[PDB]
Symmetry: C4
Amino acid sequence: RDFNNLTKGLCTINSWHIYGKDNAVRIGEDSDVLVTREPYVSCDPDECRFYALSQGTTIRGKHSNGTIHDRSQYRALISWPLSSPPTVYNSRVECIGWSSTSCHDGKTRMSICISGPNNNASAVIWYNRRPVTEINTWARNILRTQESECVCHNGVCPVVFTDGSATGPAETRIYYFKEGKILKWEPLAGTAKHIEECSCYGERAEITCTCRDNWQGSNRPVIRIDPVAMTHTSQYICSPVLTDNPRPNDPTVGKCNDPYPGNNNNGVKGFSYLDGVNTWLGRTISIASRSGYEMLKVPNALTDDKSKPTQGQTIVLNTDWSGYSGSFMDYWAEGECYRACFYVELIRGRPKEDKVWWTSNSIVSMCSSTEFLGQWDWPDGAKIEYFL
Amino acid sequence: RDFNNLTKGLCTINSWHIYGKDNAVRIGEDSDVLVTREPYVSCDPDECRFYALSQGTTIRGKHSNGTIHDRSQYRALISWPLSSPPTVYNSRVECIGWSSTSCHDGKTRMSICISGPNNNASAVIWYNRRPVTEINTWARNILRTQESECVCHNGVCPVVFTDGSATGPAETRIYYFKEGKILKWEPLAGTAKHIEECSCYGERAEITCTCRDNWQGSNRPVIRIDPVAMTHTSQYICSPVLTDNPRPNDPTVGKCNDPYPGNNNNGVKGFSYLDGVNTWLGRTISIASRSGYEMLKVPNALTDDKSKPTQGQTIVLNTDWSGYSGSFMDYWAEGECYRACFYVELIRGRPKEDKVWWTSNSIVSMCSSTEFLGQWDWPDGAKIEYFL
Amino acid sequence: RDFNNLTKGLCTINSWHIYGKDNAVRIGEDSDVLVTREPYVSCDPDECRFYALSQGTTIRGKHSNGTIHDRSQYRALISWPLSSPPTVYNSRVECIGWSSTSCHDGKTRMSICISGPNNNASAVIWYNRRPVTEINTWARNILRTQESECVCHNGVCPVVFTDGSATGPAETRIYYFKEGKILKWEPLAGTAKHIEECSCYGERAEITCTCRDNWQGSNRPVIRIDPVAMTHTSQYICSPVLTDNPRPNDPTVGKCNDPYPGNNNNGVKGFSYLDGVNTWLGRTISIASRSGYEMLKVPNALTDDKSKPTQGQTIVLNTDWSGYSGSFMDYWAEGECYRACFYVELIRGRPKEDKVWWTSNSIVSMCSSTEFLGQWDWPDGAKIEYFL
Amino acid sequence: RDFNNLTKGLCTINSWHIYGKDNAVRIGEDSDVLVTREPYVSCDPDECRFYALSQGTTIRGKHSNGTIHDRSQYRALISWPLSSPPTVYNSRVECIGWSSTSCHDGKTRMSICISGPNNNASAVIWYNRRPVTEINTWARNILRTQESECVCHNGVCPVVFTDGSATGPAETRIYYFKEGKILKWEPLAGTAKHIEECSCYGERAEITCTCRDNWQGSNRPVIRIDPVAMTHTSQYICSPVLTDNPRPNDPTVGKCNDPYPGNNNNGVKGFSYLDGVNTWLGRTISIASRSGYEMLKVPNALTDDKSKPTQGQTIVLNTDWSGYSGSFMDYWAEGECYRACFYVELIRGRPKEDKVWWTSNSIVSMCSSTEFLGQWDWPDGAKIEYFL
Ligand SMILES: *[C@@H]1O[C@H](CO)[C@@H](O[C@@H]2O[C@H](CO)[C@@H](O[C@@H]3O[C@H](CO)[C@@H](O)[C@H](O[C@H]4O[C@H](CO)[C@@H](O)[C@H](O)[C@@H]4O[C@H]4O[C@H](CO)[C@@H](O)[C@H](O)[C@@H]4O[C@H]4O[C@H](CO)[C@@H](O)[C@H](O)[C@@H]4O)[C@@H]3O)[C@H](O)[C@H]2NC(C)=O)[C@H](O)[C@H]1NC(C)=O
Ligand SMILES: *[C@@H]1O[C@H](CO)[C@@H](O[C@@H]2O[C@H](CO)[C@@H](O[C@@H]3O[C@H](CO)[C@@H](O)[C@H](O[C@H]4O[C@H](CO)[C@@H](O)[C@H](O)[C@@H]4O[C@H]4O[C@H](CO)[C@@H](O)[C@H](O)[C@@H]4O[C@H]4O[C@H](CO)[C@@H](O)[C@H](O)[C@@H]4O)[C@@H]3O)[C@H](O)[C@H]2NC(C)=O)[C@H](O)[C@H]1NC(C)=O
Ligand SMILES: *[C@@H]1O[C@H](CO)[C@@H](O[C@@H]2O[C@H](CO)[C@@H](O[C@@H]3O[C@H](CO)[C@@H](O)[C@H](O[C@H]4O[C@H](CO)[C@@H](O)[C@H](O)[C@@H]4O[C@H]4O[C@H](CO)[C@@H](O)[C@H](O)[C@@H]4O[C@H]4O[C@H](CO)[C@@H](O)[C@H](O)[C@@H]4O)[C@@H]3O)[C@H](O)[C@H]2NC(C)=O)[C@H](O)[C@H]1NC(C)=O
Ligand SMILES: *[C@@H]1O[C@H](CO)[C@@H](O[C@@H]2O[C@H](CO)[C@@H](O[C@@H]3O[C@H](CO)[C@@H](O)[C@H](O[C@H]4O[C@H](CO)[C@@H](O)[C@H](O)[C@@H]4O[C@H]4O[C@H](CO)[C@@H](O)[C@H](O)[C@@H]4O[C@H]4O[C@H](CO)[C@@H](O)[C@H](O)[C@@H]4O)[C@@H]3O)[C@H](O)[C@H]2NC(C)=O)[C@H](O)[C@H]1NC(C)=O
Ligand SMILES: CCCN(C)C(=O)[C@@H]1OC(C(=O)O)=C[C@H](NC(=N)N)[C@H]1NC(C)=O
Ligand SMILES: CCCN(C)C(=O)[C@@H]1OC(C(=O)O)=C[C@H](NC(=N)N)[C@H]1NC(C)=O
Ligand SMILES: CCCN(C)C(=O)[C@@H]1OC(C(=O)O)=C[C@H](NC(=N)N)[C@H]1NC(C)=O
Ligand SMILES: CCCN(C)C(=O)[C@@H]1OC(C(=O)O)=C[C@H](NC(=N)N)[C@H]1NC(C)=O
Ligand SMILES: *[C@@H]1O[C@H](CO)[C@@H](O)[C@H](O)[C@H]1NC(C)=O
Ligand SMILES: *[C@@H]1O[C@H](CO)[C@@H](O)[C@H](O)[C@H]1NC(C)=O
Ligand SMILES: *[C@@H]1O[C@H](CO)[C@@H](O)[C@H](O)[C@H]1NC(C)=O
Ligand SMILES: *[C@@H]1O[C@H](CO)[C@@H](O)[C@H](O)[C@H]1NC(C)=O
Ligand SMILES: *[C@@H]1O[C@H](CO)[C@@H](O)[C@H](O)[C@H]1NC(C)=O
Ligand SMILES: *[C@@H]1O[C@H](CO)[C@@H](O)[C@H](O)[C@H]1NC(C)=O
Ligand SMILES: *[C@@H]1O[C@H](CO)[C@@H](O)[C@H](O)[C@H]1NC(C)=O
Ligand SMILES: [Ca+2]
Ligand SMILES: [Ca+2]
Ligand SMILES: [Ca+2]
Ligand SMILES: [Ca+2]
């Protein structure tokens, strides 16, 4: 009908309830399930769907061998019904590429896929299921994007790309699209030293993205965007509760405008809901690997450099694998406020489970509740020994 | 369009005709069919569908091993087209949980799934396919619900939950929801000593649920609910024709307000249509196990403590397995009255058939006819030896 | 929108062009295809679909063993998209039963399935996908019907049932339904001695059914029905070109009101388009078995007892199997006249091909052309040796 | 709504971006994928889809043996969602035949399938999913058509057929259809000596088809059609950059009205966008086999007999197989101009890869960009050794 506008604020988050889970690897052991990675969730005004980058093969298929590799000509952005597994028969391809983002603006959906050689990649923007705009690589080093949904406000959907080095300063830009066309683009500003895979959400006409500094920060950079004035700024989450991975152990005081040193040249896509005292951070439990996952309420994490957890909820136990995690919300749900949600990718296979030759994942997603619900852990659930 | 109101009464039930059958286990022997249990049927104004709690694996899949267990993080409430099997490709997930109920109010459908640890479970109410309300456990002992459809009247859909002990007094409540929100909740009243898995139907603005006393009753408790005044009352079916399982042999006189003693700490979900002389009870044939199934016309069973069968119809022979059974009706069918219907879960696998390591079921459902139709038996039809 | 009325007459039939073919057995050798038999084709105002009675198992499944048997509790009437195979995932169940018919009246579709023991079977009429009317057996000997589509005119859809002996006089009735309700029913009249599996079509407000005399006739009975006056009459096709199977060799003169003697207690469902000089008969090529299939233009076959073929078209070669065949037409196609069509069931497996333990079929269907198109044969195409 | 009119001209083509890729053979190694060949892409006003001629079997199925053969009764024109593989469950059959074409006129789609013996084949035209017109063979030697989409303008959709010898003069006609009916037909005119498998597109009320001279030309014939005046003319592409296959090496000067001699009795379907300086030709890289594929900008190729490439883009590397290629465009995309697109069939199996007994293909399709995007190669991606 009309373009969606971010007119509400977040609901109070007192706990998290189970929203969706696809059990993809359990089911894929004996069904035509596609091998995937880099999943996310994204809503249209009438349906919320699961998304991920397919590897172009089923788990049990012979071509599943080698799917640890990130970029090839056989990947494509696919969507499928919420909580169903990504099967060969119920999956809709959105576009061809090894990096992506997608969001509905209220009228229709925009999907962006990037494909190509490391030095000659290009993004092709789709709007209403047709290619509209194309952007060629500017730094010649793996043009890449969010890997989770973008957000729009009155037709304008900012998207964050990064092109260049994974472990140095790189060239990051914020494009503002309206109906698949580019309205403008900015170089990254503020104090964030490196930006990768931003996880964004929107409330009260402002857009917040919690990204990943793959270079030196163990604390996460934040990009606040103003979709009306088409400007932005960046900093790091101040709190000592570090949320990247691998990372150092939490100190007693954090940094607001510089990476917290410790681990270099690595990370994991993650997110956070930053809302004053109503602030929750997500992080792997393990500081060493992508294992376990928990949510922690850390009031004023963004600005308070001594902020520590006041509440928590375990999502995945530290004995179970996790992986990418990002935010999304149903901007079209009835209600006075926007209910915060997030997904967690549960990686199975390589590199950790070397007994199999493939790498895939399933998804678990939760949304907030104003109640103080009891908690449960949500592991992938597949038994690797059944695949040998 | 508008909220449905229960304005009609039941049609005269002179016999039962075959409505739907999915042959799930026969077909699943060589198709990607999901392992399920606790099925039911429920109609929308334009389509009637099959529902059940998936186990998150196919029958032939390796993860089918162990599916006798009731609660895990891999179950989800799924729906699929009438008479089709619950396959990985044609099943729609309604919500994540190991206990559930669902009903259409005329405008849209409400689904409720419960998940969690035995001591920290929570119900999340979905309305129009979005989470709306959440309820945390009140007795810390397996918050659970109906396992068959709820019923609505003018926007209000009462639902019966029970939390606490399976074999003692427990805390049972009747919530009245309207558009996914709670309007009110009551503690159970009347003479019923224990309530579990209520099977409900509605006629002439009153809602009747035949439940299960897992503690000491072999006769079934009944909860009559008034969706307008939002009140209720409870008693037991008076008739000596006992319908729980396992149960004693029928006496010559039954009890109206106390459990009929005999078997303790066990039962099976069942239903009954209680309508004066137009009253039919469903029960397993076997008093010892979930085997066979028959319908018996027992005039005034609810109130007449000496009422005995005047007519009958065998559904499943006593040599074939049965299981849960419950009521539903197409409140949107053309007609002067509501046609009574019911489904019977046909369990295959463990505990009875120990040759396989899984537990699943198929479904048979019938609706009433005013004719006196000939009868036939409707077994599951799968040959277990093909699965070894 | 509104009830369809048979206002046109047949188009001139100068040849037959290929309409649909599903290649079900070729494809089912390595896909989840349902075992079927007794197929037909039937159109809705916006789509034409394939129909058949499923056996409740896939061809490759273990339960495919034994599917030569006609009546069991595992059969159901299913429909699927034109030219697709009847797969477990794209098939819609219309109703449960081992005998059936179905037709769209312009507003919605009526489907009738019969199920039960040989001596206590019952038909349940569905209209707009809900059960509406039920009819119990009247002769206690396998209540059965057409096995191909019925036809409607202004809301009234006559259907021919037969109950009783397969090899003697039996009790045949013509019901006239309107919106799933019975308007009236007649005993069979005229000279036809036995009626089974009528294949009907309609033109210029009259309905013609070519049926099967399983008792003694090798010539086919015809039932002409008047859907307005709700009356009918019956006779036999006069022509010496015999179309039942098994049958004697063609004589030089046929019979108009008595069965042509020769073979007893056997037959095959077939059809014919009877339209003066524009008359075409379909028959197996083999007089001994269900093998081969051809269409022959025999002017005035219905009334001319010495009528012989003036033109012909081979459909299936006599080295390939055939089986049931029946008529249908798209009453909603644009045009000045109704284009005659028909389908042929191509049976594979038992009884003829005893190397496998199953019995199934694929379908070939053609429609008329006013052109004189070249001909081709359309065999099933599966290689049985691949199934051993 | 209303008939589409070709009111725009081509967009400037500075490079090609990835549009769709199905990875059919990789995925089909372990999924129910149909064996196909002769694919193409075609858009409706609201969705663009993949099309191809099925072989009536899955790749892994036993009937896949022998699918190198072109014409049989088991082929059918099928369509499926863009970028999905052609699976048994998500494929819609358009018509039965071993040669075809299809296009949407703005109101609905017309599909034409040809089937039959080599000497008695016939085309049956479908419009709005119903058979409408039929055309019998005129030369008695494999009546055949485009094998890619036709184009319409104000209800009129010209289609090019050829009947007769594959290696001599044959009888080629241009039919002009409107709503499935024939408005007129012409014999081929102009200087083209042989016409086969025309690839057409439309801009500014003119229709251009680049076909294949299987007889003696290594340069491609072009048919320009005027859908309003219903007339046409033919010539050959003047450029020395030869685009058929197998072909001689490029000379320094080409021919405008005579086949360029070199290779006889062979070729491959291909296409070209002929637009003054905005002209791009597609060709296999290998002059000897269907291997590799590239696009070359050759300004004024149609008329300039000395025109050579000024720019290029590799699509498939010469070490990877290619095959048929053709044009299509989304005539219903928003925009000031029509974005040129094309597909390339990537054949796997026989004749080149004799280790397997089947022949199938996957598809890669691109559309133009006004940007100068980086290039990447897009091979089929399947590893044949996994199929042994
Ligand atoms: C029914 O459900 C209810 C509701 O869920 C249950 O109640 C909830 O119970 C939760 C579990 O106790 C509780 O969460 C906890 O809340 C406290 C604040 O009150 C919070 O501090 C906890 O988080 C710390 O501890 C967990 C491990 O237990 C860590 O994994 C977590 O990271 C937090 O500690 C780490 O960081 C801190 C800050 O830097 C450090 O001070 C601390 O040392 C620790 O650091 C080490 O570990 C880090 C992680 O590996 C590492 O990076 C670092 O380097 C150090 O090595 C936790 O969130 C909920 O608040 C509570 N909610 C409510 C409403 O009651 C109840 O149990 C259930 N009922 C039953 C019967 O079970
Ligand atoms: C064509 O179709 C028609 C229509 O279906 C067929 O006619 C129908 O035939 C039905 C079968 O006879 C008939 O049902 C019976 O109706 C009588 C009343 O007339 C009813 O009492 C029967 O039910 C008792 O018997 C069955 C076993 O036969 C039991 O399984 C059932 O539970 C009932 O008995 C038990 O409970 C009673 C009450 O307490 C006791 O008095 C009795 O002893 C027995 O108790 C023992 O068994 C219990 C169950 O295991 C156990 O818990 C307890 O502890 C005791 O051990 C039955 O419903 C239909 O009424 C009839 N309908 C019509 C319209 O005619 C016809 O056969 C078909 N045609 C052909 C040719 O076959
Ligand atoms: C390109 O396509 C065109 C168009 O299709 C081709 O032309 C068509 O060619 C058809 C084949 O010749 C032709 O059909 C024939 O038409 C004649 C009438 O002209 C018709 O009589 C033929 O039917 C008889 O013969 C076939 C076998 O050839 C039998 O199977 C059939 O049953 C008919 O004969 C049987 O019944 C008759 C009547 O009772 C008897 O007189 C006769 O003896 C025979 O009886 C025995 O066989 C019966 C069947 O088994 C059995 O029950 C009985 O007891 C006896 O044993 C046939 O229909 C088309 O008319 C013609 N159409 C046109 C427009 O031209 C052309 O070939 C193709 N082009 C090329 C190059 O091939
Ligand atoms: C990032 O991406 C950009 C954009 O893609 C890359 O830049 C592009 O790079 C392309 C590759 O160089 C370039 O294409 C080339 O453009 C030239 C014109 O400038 C064109 O002539 C080239 O085509 C000839 O060469 C290729 C092989 O290299 C042949 O396969 C092709 O057929 C053309 O040559 C053949 O035909 C000619 C005309 O007849 C003959 O003169 C020539 O001898 C040759 O003939 C033989 O081969 C034929 C084919 O087998 C055979 O039939 C015949 O008989 C003879 O045997 C090619 O298209 C793009 O123009 C360029 N685009 C832009 C915007 O820059 C860049 O590399 C990427 N970045 C990085 C870091 O890699
Ligand atoms: C490129 C350097 C930093 N970066 C963002 C990564 O390397 C990410 O790593 C991971 C990862 O799991 O850590 C997967 C991503 N894979 C993927 N999106 N296909 C990949 N991104 C790209 C574009 O390949
Ligand atoms: C909890 C005590 C009484 N009760 C209602 C049961 O135990 C029921 O038993 C059975 C059963 O088959 O008897 C299955 C139900 N399983 C299930 N719904 N997943 C289960 N309910 C729950 C919540 O687990
Ligand atoms: C009953 C006597 C005559 N008759 C019509 C038949 O026996 C038919 O035979 C055949 C047959 O192939 O000849 C299949 C039909 N099978 C079927 N419709 N399932 C069957 N009809 C019924 C009702 O079982
Ligand atoms: C008939 C002579 C020229 N010609 C156009 C061909 O032979 C084409 O060859 C090829 C081919 O791959 O070269 C496949 C086509 N196969 C196919 N469309 N099924 C076939 N056409 C027909 C009608 O069979
Ligand atoms: C968003 O705001 C714009 C004006 O600022 C308005 O035109 C549009 O309709 C609004 N969207 C909705 C969904 O109301
Ligand atoms: C149910 O009753 C309410 C008023 O009591 C009415 O507004 C509503 O429209 C009724 N529902 C239908 C389907 O008529
Ligand atoms: C199923 O699981 C049990 C316990 O996990 C194991 O002993 C048994 O062998 C398994 N059954 C099969 C067929 O693998
Ligand atoms: C069929 O005829 C009836 C009246 O005899 C008419 O009301 C109806 O609309 C007609 N059907 C159509 C499709 O015109
Ligand atoms: C099919 O069933 C029969 C009888 O039930 C049995 O003898 C036969 O071996 C079975 N065929 C196969 C392949 O199992
Ligand atoms: C195409 O042109 C015809 C008149 O020449 C017009 O009637 C039709 O509406 C036009 N199509 C569109 C889509 O405007
Ligand atoms: C395929 O068919 C040929 C000839 O029909 C046969 O020789 C060959 O062995 C078959 N290939 C396979 C794998 O069966
Ligand atoms: Ca980092
Ligand atoms: Ca009990
Ligand atoms: Ca007979
Ligand atoms: Ca050539």
